[PDB]
Design a protein around this ligand. Structure first.
Ligand code: HEM
Ligand SMILES: Cn1cccc1CN
Length: 292
């Protein structure tokens, strides 16, 4: 029942935020060696999700608004292991643009990464305001990966996401890789892991998956092509309701893009009250669209 009202950084408008977007995008292009040349796109998407996914609809605790990932309790959450790389990437961006709030920066990082990786446009709204250290949510609000479809479904009800929204959001798992030292899981999900596509769904349906144990003694689904799916990923083809939606996105790139864009914006905005006279959501141009 907490209320968080969006408050525009004083005097700022679209052009200010496009400059921040551009600085993130230029650094994504420049720092290309990260994670054996995957680059920082995937980890920035994951950061934006984890700072948002602490939200609880029941009392409006957590969520992106407060920028609380900057505090030790949250940045040391075992569920956030590896995200420090994303935070470090954003540090020089914040130094250049010290006026942007932490929640705005973390969420904008995710939007920028999706778009620069040739994903859908994600409308984005400013006005998250840093809140104090005692507003940092406790660890344990982000999801476990060893679980089944019923767990996933129930988990996401706390974030006010339905089946379609869950399956759309999970398509982000096309990106990057699991790293044994971070999460106890190892490997990429496909060949296209720094360009945003519907490959997650295609690979779920088309690869021959085998349930194996990794070197951390955890089960994961592996293919001979060298890809993997988490148990929670694979649950989307075990549950008949999720399976229908996986098939839809595997067969319609545009629909996946549109549904992902809506769900990801919603995820990043959960918990925030926007005044009726707040600016409309911004749609940033990519570097490519700007000739930059
Ligand atoms: C049931 C829900 C989810 C579970 C259990 C889950 C779990 C995981 C795990 C275990 C990793 C590997 C982390 C590592 O070892 O570095 C990962 C990576 C990732 N997750 Fe999720 N995740 C979920 C939902 C999502 C959502 C909703 C998004 C965004 C829309 C997302 C985006 C990502 C991205 C982009 C990576 C790759 C990060 C990198 O390459 O550094 N995940 N996830
Ligand atoms: C690449 N990735 C990220 C999370 C899970 C996976 C593999 N399907």
């Amino acid at each position: 029942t907490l209320v968080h009202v969006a408050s525009v950084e004083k005097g700022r408008s679209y052009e200010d935020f496009q400059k921040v977007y551009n600085a993130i995008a230029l650094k994504l292009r420049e720092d290309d060696e990260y994670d054996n040349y995957i680059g920082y796109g995937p980890v920035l998407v994951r950061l934006a999700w984890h700072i948002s996914g602490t939200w609880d609809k029941h009392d409006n605790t957590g969520g992106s608004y407060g920028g609380t990932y900057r505090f030790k309790k949250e940045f040391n959450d075992p569920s956030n292991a590896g995200l420090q790389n994303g935070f470090k990437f954003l540090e020089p961006i914040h130094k250049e643009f010290p006026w942007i709030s932490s929640g705005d920066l973390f969420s904008l990082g995710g939007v920028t990464a999706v778009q620069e990786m040739q994903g859908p446009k994600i409308p984005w709204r400013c006005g998250r305001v840093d809140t104090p250290e005692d507003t940092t949510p406790d660890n344990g609000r982000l999801p476990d990966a060893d679980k089944d479809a019923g767990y996933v479904r129930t988990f996401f009800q706390r974030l006010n996401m339905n089946d379609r929204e869950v399956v759309a959001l999970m398509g982000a798992h096309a990106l990057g890789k699991t790293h044994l030292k971070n999460s106890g899981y190892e490997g990429p999900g496909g060949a296209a892991n720094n360009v945003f596509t519907n490959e997650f769904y295609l690979n779920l349906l088309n690869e021959d998956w085998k349930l194996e144990k990794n070197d951390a003694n955890n089960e994961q689904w592996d293919s001979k092509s060298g890809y993997m799916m988490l148990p929670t990923d694979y649950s989307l083809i075990q549950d008949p309701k999720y399976l229908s939606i996986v098939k839809e996105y595997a067969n319609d790139q545009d629909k996946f893009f549109k549904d992902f864009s809506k769900a990801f914006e919603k995820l990043l905005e959960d918990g925030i009250t926007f005044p009726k006279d707040a600016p409309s959501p911004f749609i940033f141009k990519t570097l490519e669209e700007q000739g930059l």
